[PDB]
Design a protein around this ligand. Structure first.
Ligand SMILES: *C[C@@H](*)[C@H]1/C(=C/c2[nH]c(/C=C3N=C(/C=C4\NC(=O)C(CC)=C4C)C(C)=C\3CCC(=O)O)c(CCC(=O)O)c2C)NC(=O)[C@@H]1C
Ligand SMILES: *C[C@@H](*)[C@H]1/C(=C/c2[nH]c(/C=C3N=C(/C=C4\NC(=O)C(CC)=C4C)C(C)=C\3CCC(=O)O)c(CCC(=O)O)c2C)NC(=O)[C@@H]1C
Ligand SMILES: *C[C@@H](*)[C@H]1/C(=C/c2[nH]c(/C=C3N=C(/C=C4\NC(=O)C(CC)=C4C)C(C)=C\3CCC(=O)O)c(CCC(=O)O)c2C)NC(=O)[C@@H]1C
Ligand SMILES: *[C@H](C)[C@H]1/C(=C/c2[nH]c(/C=C3N=C(/C=C4\NC(=O)C(CC)=C4C)C(C)=C\3CCC(=O)O)c(CCC(=O)O)c2C)NC(=O)[C@@H]1C
Ligand SMILES: *[C@H](C)[C@H]1/C(=C/c2[nH]c(/C=C3N=C(/C=C4\NC(=O)C(CC)=C4C)C(C)=C\3CCC(=O)O)c(CCC(=O)O)c2C)NC(=O)[C@@H]1C
Ligand SMILES: *[C@H](C)[C@H]1/C(=C/c2[nH]c(/C=C3N=C(/C=C4\NC(=O)C(CC)=C4C)C(C)=C\3CCC(=O)O)c(CCC(=O)O)c2C)NC(=O)[C@@H]1C
Ligand SMILES: *[C@H](C)[C@H]1/C(=C/c2[nH]c(/C=C3N=C(/C=C4\NC(=O)C(CC)=C4C)C(C)=C\3CCC(=O)O)c(CCC(=O)O)c2C)NC(=O)[C@@H]1C
Ligand SMILES: *[C@H](C)[C@H]1/C(=C/c2[nH]c(/C=C3N=C(/C=C4\NC(=O)C(CC)=C4C)C(C)=C\3CCC(=O)O)c(CCC(=O)O)c2C)NC(=O)[C@@H]1C
Lengths: 161, 68, 241, 160, 161, 160, 161, 160, 161, 161
C-alpha cells in the first residue's frame, strides 16, 4: 500500500529527482489536513456498529434478500454480509487516513468482483449498502471531512460496479 | 542426520479449547538438527516451556557425516 | 404468515440451494492426534495425512513405502507435524509435485498442501520462491511447516487440511481454484505474480489537499507577516517576472 | 512511512486504529514540517556533501582507488560518487517520510547481491555513508543533526 | 452433498415451506427402501475387487488398450485405470446409499471430462467399463436393488459421455 | 538413467553436479559400448531365452499350468510368455540406460495391483525372471553376464 | 525430464519394440560426445559468476534498465534479474548435460512468459542477456562444446520470444 | 563419499541399492588405487603447491597485501597460506573419498559467514584456490590432473 | 552415518592431519574387499523375503510366540515382527556395504531396547531371529562375505542384548 | 435452437436409435400440452406492453435508477432498458412455446452477463425486472400454464445472476 507521502516519494524516486517546490507543496497540503483525518477516523471507529446497522436497515433487510432463498437469508449469510460491510468500513477508514485509494485497490477490490460472481452475491445490493454507509458516515463526520470520506466510498462503489 | 528428542509444554492462552487436546500441549518428539533451531524459537515465542532436550542420534564430536 | 414467504416465488427450487460458499467447506472432517488414539482411529489419521499432502490422487498408490514413519508416529516418537514434514522430504513428493513444474508453481503446490491456501501476496512469493531456489525443497518445506501460520492454525497434532480463507482479497478465489482441480487437471500456476495496481487518482486532486493548496498559495503571495513593516513594504512578490 | 506502518500493523490484526496509533500519527504530522525543512536543507547542499564524503572515503580507504580497487579510474570513481548521491537522496526520502520504508524497498533489500555481483567492498560503501553522515551533520543544527544521523546510522547498519 | 432427506429439506427451506403431504410422501418413499440400499451396499463392498476384475476382463483387457500404444499400457497406467474403476464403484455405492446424484456431480464429474481430455484417456472405454461394472453389480445384488444401483451408473456414464 | 538421476538430485538440491556425479557420468559413457553389445546380444537371443525360461518355469511350478493356476491353457501360457518378452525388453532397456528409471516407470510401479487384479502369482513370475537370468547369463561372458544379472536381480527384488 | 537415451527408450517403448540398429546409432552418437559435455559443464560451474557478470555488463547494465524508471532499477529488482540469469545458466548446463531441451521446457519455460508479462519484465532485455551469456559460454568452453552449449541457449531465447 | 551418498539416498527412499548405485560403487572401488596415488602425490607436494599458489595469488591481487588489504602483514599472509593448506588438505580428502561430503561438512558450509565476519575477499580466496589447481595440475598426468581439477573446480564454485 | 573412509577421514580431520601411510593402508584394506560387499548385498536383496521366511520358521513360529498369549500372536503383531525383521535385514545390508556399524547404531539401535521393554517385545526371541537371519545370509552369500556380513548381525544382536 | 421434439430426436440420433416407447411417451406428453402453450403465448403477445409497464413501475422506476446518474437516467437509456425487457419477454414466449430453454441459452444468455459488466448495467436490477415480469405473466396466463411460464423466467434470472 501507499499514502500521500509515499506516493509523492515514489513518484519522485522513479525519476530519481530530489524533492522540489511542487513536491514540498503537495507534502504541506497533506500535512495541513492531518488533524481532520484523525478526528474523522476516531468518530468512525467509535460509531462503527451503528453505521453498519443503519446502512443494513436502510438498504438491505426487510426485503427478498433476507426472506427465504435470498442471498442474505440464514444466519450464516447474514453474519457474512455484515462482516463484509464492516470490512468495507474499516478499509475506507484506512484509505481516509492515508489519503490514497491505493490500499483500496490493493487489499479490497482485486478479485472481489469475480469472487462475488463465484458466490452469487448481488453486486448492486452490495453497492447500495456501501452508499448507505457513505451517507451515514458523511452525516457523522461533519462538514470538515464529509467530502473526503465520501470520495473513498464512491471509489469502492465504482470499483465494484 | 542428527535428531533431537525434545519434550515441551505449550499452554493455551486464549479460547481455552474444548475437545480433549492433550497431545497439543505437552509432547515429546524427535526433531531434526536443521529444523530444531527454528522450532525451539517458535516454542518459546508461543509462550511454551522446553522441559527437556536430548541429542539422541548424533555424535558430539561430529566433523563428518553430520550433513548427510 | 405472508411476511415469511419468499416474494418473487422460487419457481425453480435448488437453484437457490447451492448459492454461497460450497458445502465442502463444512462437509469434511478434521483429524487430530490427541483424539485419534486407538488403532482404528490412528489408521484414519494416517490415511488422511496422505491425502492432505499428495492431493488424493497419487495417495491411493501408497502401499508401504512410509512404514518407518508410521511406526514412530504410532509409538509417539514423532508428532503429526513431524510426520507431515517428513512426508514432504520424501522422493515421492519431490518426484510428483516438484520434478514436473516450474520453480514458481512448486511454491504454490507446497502452500496448498502444507498450509491449505494459495499465496497471499507478492511479498510472500518473493520470500518463499527466493528461498526454494536458494536451497531447494528441504528448506522451503521446513519454512512452511515451522512458520508462525502453521503453528497458529494446526499446532503439534493436526492434519493441515484445506482452509477457505476470507482475507486477504483474491485469496478465497485463488484457493478455491486450486481446491477444485484434480491432479494434472490443469497446470497453469493460477497466481503467477501480483500485478502492480498503479494509481488513477492524483493525491493533489482530493478535497482536503486541494483545498489547502489554494490557501497555501494565497498566504504566501498576498499577505505580509511579523517582520518590520519597513522590510515588508519593499518586497517584490514575483521572483523573475 | 509512519502512517503506512501503523495502517499495516492495524490491518494485520483486522481492527480499527487504537488511540495510541492516532497519537503517533499526530506526533508525525506535527514533526512533518521540521522533517521536510531538514530534507530541503540537505537537498540544497547535495553536491558539496557528496564531494566531501568522496574525498574523505578515498582518504580512509585508498585501496578502492588503487589498481586492485573496485573504484580504480575516473569513471569508476564517478560511479561511486553517483551511488553516494543515490544514498543521500534515499536518506532525504526517509527523513521526509519519517520511516525507513522507502529506503528499504529502494536501496537496501538485495544490496548484498548488488555489491557481491559487482565485487564492491560493502564496508567501503558503509564508510562512504559515514563520511556522508559527517558532512550532513556539519551543515545542520544539533537536533536536526541527530535526526538525520538516526537514518544515516540505519543505512550504515543495513549495509552490513 | 445431499441425500434424499436433506434434498427435500433444502428444497422446502428455499421456498420457506413447512413439510406437507407431498414432501412427507417423498420421505416415506425413500424410507421404505432403506434396508435394500444397505444390503446392496454391503454386498458391493464385500465384492468390490471381483466386480472390477470381471468388468476389466469383459470391457478393457485383451485388446489394443493394454497393448503398446494403448492408454492402459504399462503397469502404472493399468493401476491408474483400475483405481479410477474403484473410484467409480465407491462413488456409485455412495450415490445409491444417499439416493441422490449430488455427490457424483460434486466430487466426481466436476472437471472429469476435460481432465480425461488433457490426459488422453478414452472416454468411450471408460463408459464401457462403467457399464460392465453396472452389469456385474446388477448380477450380484439381485432384483431388489438392481435398477436402483443401475440408475447411478447410468448417471455417471451419461455425465462422462 | 544415471544422467537423469544425477540431474534430478542436483536440481532438487539447487546446485551444479558434484564431482562424484561427473565421475559416474564419465564411467557410464565409457561403459556404453559394452552395454550396447550386451543389449544386442540379448535382443538377438530374445526368443530362445523366453522359450527356455518358460521351460524351467513350468518345470519348477507345474501348478501354474495346472487348472487351478493363472496360466492354465495354451493362450494363458502365451500371455505369460508375452509378459516374459515384455520383461526381457525392459531388462535390455535398463541395461542400455545404465539405471532403473525406465524399467521402474514402465513395469514395476503398480505391478502388484495389476497382478493382484489378474490373480497371477508374483513369486511365480519372479521365478520365471530368474530362469530368464540363467538363460541370458548362459549366452554371455562373465563381466557382462554379471552386468545383466544385476538388472535381472533388480527386477526380481522389485517383484517382492 | 528426459535425456537422449531416455527419449529413445520411451520412443521405442511406445511401440513396444526392442532396440534396433537405428536407436543404437542415435545413442552411439550421444555416447561419442560424453566427455566434452562433462568438461564444458565443469568449466561453466567454475565460471558461473564471471559469465553472469560479463553478460550483464555487455547486455543489461549502463542503460535505462538500471537507471530510475528501468525495470532492473533498485537493488531488489537487480538481484531478481541476476538470480534469473543464474537460473538460465544452471538450467542450460543441465539441458546440455542431458542432451535434451525437455528440462528447459519443463522446469523453466512453462509460464515464464506470462509471469514476465504480469510483472512487466522486459522479454527483449532478457533474451539479450541470455544471448550474451551464450556468447560468454561459447568463448569459455572452446570449439569442442561451443555449438552444443549454444543450441540450448538459443532454445531458451526462442522459447521466451 | 560415494558410498555415503548412495546409502543415504537408498535409506531415504527405503529400498535396497539400485544397479546404477552398485555400478558406481564398483567403479569407485576400482579407481581407489589411482585416487590414493593422486592423494599421496598431492600430500607430498603440498608445500610447493601452497607456495606457488601464494605467489600467483599475490601477483594477481597485490592489493590484498596492500595496507588496505585483509592480507596485509607477514602473519596475515601466513594465515592465508595456512587456510590454503587447509583447503588443499580438504581437496585430498575429497579425492580419496570419491565425493565432496567431507569437504562440505568441513569448509564450504558457513564459509560465506567465515569471510564476511572476517572481512576476507572470497573472490581472492577463489583465485588462490585456482592457483593451487594450476600448481597441482602441473604435478600430475593428464587423467589424474583432470580428476584433481574437478575437485579444485568444485571448491572454486562453492567459493561463489 | 559414516563408512570406513569417512571414519578415517574424520579421525584425521580432528587432528588436522594429512592422510599418511596408516590411513592409506586402512583405505586399501577397505578397497580390496569392495566387490565382495557388492555381490553379497545383491544376493541379499534378491533373497530378502526367503531369508525372512526361513529365519522365522527356524526361530519364531511353531512356538508359544505365535499362539495365544504370545507376542507374535495376531496378524498385527506378526506384521510388526516381520517388518522389524525386514528392517534388520536392510540395515544390516547397509552397514555391511558401508563397512561400519554407524548406520545401525544411528537409525536402528537408538531407543529400540527401551521401546521393546515398554511394548513387551521379547528381546531374546528377537536376537534368536536375528541370528537365524545371519546364518541364512552366511549360507547364501558364501565364504567370501559370510563372516563379513555376520559381524554386523552380531553387532545388532549385541546392541539389542 | 431446439424444441422438445427436436431435443428427443437429437438425443436418439446421437445413439442412432429408432424411436421407442420412452420416446413416444415423451412426444405424447409434449403433444398433449399443445393448446395450453398456444393460449399462453397469445395472451402474452396481446398483453406485452402492459406487462413491461407494470414490471418497470414495480421494480425499476421511482428510484435512483431513474434519478440522475442512474443507469436508466436519460431517455436514451430508458428506451434501451424497456427494449431489453421486451427482448426478455419475447424470448421467454419463444421458449415457452418450444418447451425447451435451449433458445434461451443460445440467443439470450450467451455473453449477456459480460456485456452487462461491460456497459455497467445493474444485473440485480435486471433480475428484479425479470421477476416482476414473471409475476405479471403468471397472473395473466391463468392456472393452466402459470408454472410453465414461471420456469423460463426463473431460468433467465438464474442464468443472469
Ligand atoms: C452486504 C452483504 C452481501 C452479501 C455477502 C456475502 N459474502 C459472503 C462471503 C464472502 N465474502 C468475502 C469477502 C471478502 N474477501 C476479502 O478478501 C475481503 C476483504 C477483506 C472481502 C470483503 C469472501 C471471500 C467470502 C467467501 C468466504 C467466507 O464466507 O468468508 C457471503 C456468504 C456466502 C456463503 O456462505 O456461501 C455472503 C452472504 N450477501 C448479500 O446478500 C449482501 C448483498
Ligand atoms: C563509494 C563508491 C563505492 C563503489 C561503487 C560502485 N558501484 C558501481 C556500479 C553500480 N552501482 C549501482 C548501484 C545502484 N543501483 C540502484 O538502483 C541502487 C539503489 C539506489 C544502487 C545503489 C549499479 C546499478 C551499478 C552498475 C552500473 C550502472 O549503474 O549502470 C561501480 C562500478 C563497477 C563496475 O564493474 O563497473 C562501482 C565502483 N566502489 C567503491 O570502491 C566504493 C565502495
Ligand atoms: C479404466 C481406466 C481407464 C484409464 C484411466 C486413467 N486415469 C489416469 C489418471 C487420472 N485419473 C484421475 C481420476 C480421478 N481423480 C478424481 O478425483 C476422480 C473422482 C473422485 C477421478 C475419476 C486423475 C485425477 C488422474 C490423474 C492423476 C493420476 O494419475 O492419478 C490415467 C493415467 C494417465 C497418465 O499416465 O498420465 C489413466 C490411464 N485409462 C484407460 O485406458 C481406461 C479407459
Ligand atoms: C421475537 C421472539 C424476538 C424479536 C425478533 C425480531 N426480529 C427482527 C428482525 C429480523 N429477524 C430476522 C431473522 C432471521 N433471518 C434468518 O435467516 C433467520 C434464520 C431462519 C432468522 C431467525 C431477520 C432477517 C430480521 C430482519 C428483517 C427481515 O427479516 O427482513 C425484529 C425487527 C428488528 C428491527 O426492526 O430493527 C425483531 C423485533 N424481538 C424480540 O424482542 C423477541 C424476543
Ligand atoms: C507368466 C510368466 C505368468 C502369468 C501371466 C499372465 N499375464 C496375464 C495377463 C496380462 N499380463 C499383462 C501384463 C502387462 N501389461 C503391461 O503393460 C506390462 C508391463 C510391460 C505387463 C507385464 C496384461 C496387460 C495382461 C492382461 C491381458 C492383456 O495384455 O490384454 C495372464 C492372463 C490372465 C487372465 O485372466 O486371462 C497371465 C496368465 N501367469 C503365470 O502363471 C505366470 C507366473
Ligand atoms: C533479468 C535479466 C531481467 C529481470 C528480471 C526480474 N525477474 C523478477 C521476478 C521473478 N523472476 C522469476 C523467475 C523465475 N521463476 C522460475 O521458476 C524460473 C525458472 C526456473 C524463473 C526464471 C519469478 C518467479 C519472479 C517473481 C518472484 C521474485 O521476484 O522472485 C523481477 C522482480 C520484479 C518485481 O520487482 O516485482 C525482475 C526485475 N529484470 C530485468 O531488467 C531483466 C530483463
Ligand atoms: C519380531 C521379530 C518381534 C516382535 C516385534 C514387534 N515390534 C512391535 C512394534 C514396533 N517395532 C518398531 C520398530 C522399528 N521402528 C523403526 O523405525 C525401526 C528401524 C527403522 C524399527 C526396528 C517400533 C518403533 C514399534 C512400535 C510402533 C509399531 O507398533 O509400529 C510390535 C508391536 C507391539 C504392540 O502390539 O504394541 C511387535 C510385536 N514381536 C515378536 O514376537 C518378535 C520377537
Ligand atoms: C408533465 C408536464 C407531463 C407528465 C409527466 C409525467 N412524468 C412521469 C414520470 C417520469 N418522467 C420521467 C422522465 C424523464 N427521465 C429522464 O431521464 C428524462 C430526461 C431528462 C425525463 C424527462 C421518468 C423517468 C419518469 C418515471 C418516474 C421517475 O422519474 O422515477 C409521470 C408519472 C407517470 C406514472 O405512471 O407514474 C408523469 C405524470 N404527465 C402529464 O400529463 C404532463 C403533460
Amino acid at each position: 500500500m501507499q499514502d500521500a507521502i509515499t506516493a509523492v516519494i515514489n513518484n519522485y524516486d522513479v525519476q530519481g529527482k530530489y524533492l522540489d517546490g511542487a513536491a514540498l507543496d503537495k507534502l504541506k497540503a497533506y500535512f495541513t489536513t492531518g488533524a481532520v483525518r484523525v478526528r474523522a477516523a476516531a468518530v468512525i471507529s467509535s460509531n462503527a456498529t451503528t453505521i453498519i446497522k443503519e446502512a443494513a436497515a436502510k438498504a438491505l433487510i426487510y426485503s427478498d434478500l433476507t426472506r427465504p432463498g435470498g442471498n442474505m437469508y440464514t444466519t450464516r449469510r447474514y453474519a457474512a454480509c455484515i462482516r463484509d460491510m464492516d470490512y468495507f468500513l474499516r478499509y475506507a477508514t484506512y484509505a481516509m487516513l492515508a489519503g490514497d485509494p491505493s490500499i483500496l485497490d490493493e487489499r479490497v477490490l482485486n478479485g472481489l468482483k469475480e469472487t462475488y460472481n463465484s458466490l452469487g452475491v448481488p453486486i448492486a445490493a452490495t453497492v447500495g449498502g456501501i452508499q448507505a454507509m457513505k451517507e451515514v458516515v458523511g452525516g457523522l463526520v461533519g462538514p470538515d471531512a464529509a467530502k473526503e470520506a465520501s470520495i473513498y466510498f464512491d471509489y469502492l462503489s465504482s470499483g465494484l460496479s | 542426520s542428527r535428531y533431537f528428542k525434545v519434550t515441551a509444554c505449550i499452554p493455551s492462552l486464549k479460547r481455552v479449547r474444548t475437545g480433549r487436546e492433550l497431545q497439543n500441549t505437552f509432547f515429546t518428539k524427535l526433531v531434526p538438527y536443521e529444523n530444531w533451531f527454528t522450532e525451539q524459537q517458535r516454542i518459546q515465542k508461543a509462550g511454551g516451556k522446553v522441559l527437556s532436550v536430548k541429542l539422541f542420534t548424533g555424535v558430539q564430536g561430529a566433523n563428518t557425516g553430520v550433513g548427510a | 404468515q405472508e411476511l415469511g414467504t419468499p416474494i418473487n416465488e422460487r419457481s425453480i427450487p435448488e437453484m437457490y440451494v447451492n448459492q454461497g460458499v460450497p458445502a465442502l467447506k463444512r462437509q469434511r472432517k478434521v483429524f487430530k492426534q490427541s483424539q485419534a488414539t486407538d488403532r482404528e482411529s490412528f489408521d484414519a489419521l494416517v490415511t488422511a495425512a496422505y491425502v492432505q499432502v499428495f492431493d488424493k490422487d497419487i495417495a491411493s498408490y501408497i502401499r508401504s513405502e512410509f512404514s518407518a514413519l508410521e511406526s514412530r508416529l504410532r509409538n509417539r516418537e514423532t508428532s503429526v507435524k513431524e510426520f507431515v514434514r517428513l512426508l514432504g522430504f520424501s522422493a515421492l513428493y519431490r518426484k510428483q509435485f516438484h520434478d514436473r513444474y516450474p520453480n514458481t508453481k512448486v511454491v504454490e503446490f507446497a502452500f496448498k498442501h502444507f498450509l491449505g491456501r494459495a499465496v497471499k501476496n507478492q511479498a510472500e512469493l518473493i520470500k518463499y520462491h527466493g528461498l526454494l531456489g536458494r536451497k531447494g525443497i528441504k528448506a522451503l518445506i521446513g519454512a512452511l511447516v515451522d512458520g508462525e501460520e502453521y503453528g497458529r492454525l494446526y499446532g503439534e497434532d493436526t492434519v493441515p487440511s484445506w482452509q477457505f480463507p476470507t482475507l486477504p482479497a483474491a485469496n478465497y478465489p485463488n484457493s478455491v481454484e486450486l481446491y477444485n482441480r484434480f491432479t494434472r487437471q490443469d497446470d497453469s500456476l493460477v497466481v503467477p505474480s501480483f500485478k502492480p495496481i498503479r494509481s488513477k487518482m492524483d493525491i493533489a486532486s482530493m478535497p482536503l489537499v486541494q483545498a489547502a493548496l489554494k490557501e497555501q498559495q494565497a498566504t504566501k503571495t498576498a499577505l505580509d507577516m511579523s517582520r518590520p513593516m519597513f522590510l515588508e513594504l519593499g518586497r517584490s512578490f514575483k521572483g523573475a517576472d | 512511512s509512519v502512517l503506512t506502518k501503523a495502517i499495516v500493523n492495524a490491518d494485520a490484526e483486522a481492527r480499527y486504529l487504537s488511540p495510541g496509533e492516532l497519537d503517533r500519527i499526530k506526533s508525525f504530522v506535527a514533526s512533518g514540517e521540521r522533517r521536510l525543512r531538514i530534507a530541503q536543507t540537505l537537498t540544497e547542499a547535495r553536491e558539496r556533501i557528496v564531494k566531501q564524503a568522496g574525498d574523505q572515503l578515498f582518504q580512509i580507504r585508498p585501496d578502492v582507488v588503487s589498481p586492485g580497487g573496485n573504484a580504480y579510474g575516473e569513471k569508476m570513481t564517478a560511479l561511486c560518487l553517483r551511488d553516494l548521491d543515490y544514498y543521500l537522496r534515499l536518506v532525504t526520502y526517509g527523513i521526509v517520510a519519517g520511516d525507513v520504508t522507502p529506503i528499504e524497498e529502494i536501496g537496501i533489500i538485495g544490496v548484498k547481491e548488488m555489491y557481491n555481483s559487482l565485487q564492491t567492498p560493502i564496508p567501503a560503501v558503509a564508510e562512504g555513508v559515514r563520511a556522508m553522515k559527517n558532512v550532513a551533520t556539519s551543515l545542520l543544527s544539533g537536533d536536526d543533526a541527530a535526526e538525520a544521523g538516526f537514518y544515516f546510522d540505519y543505512l550504515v547498519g543495513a549495509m552490513q
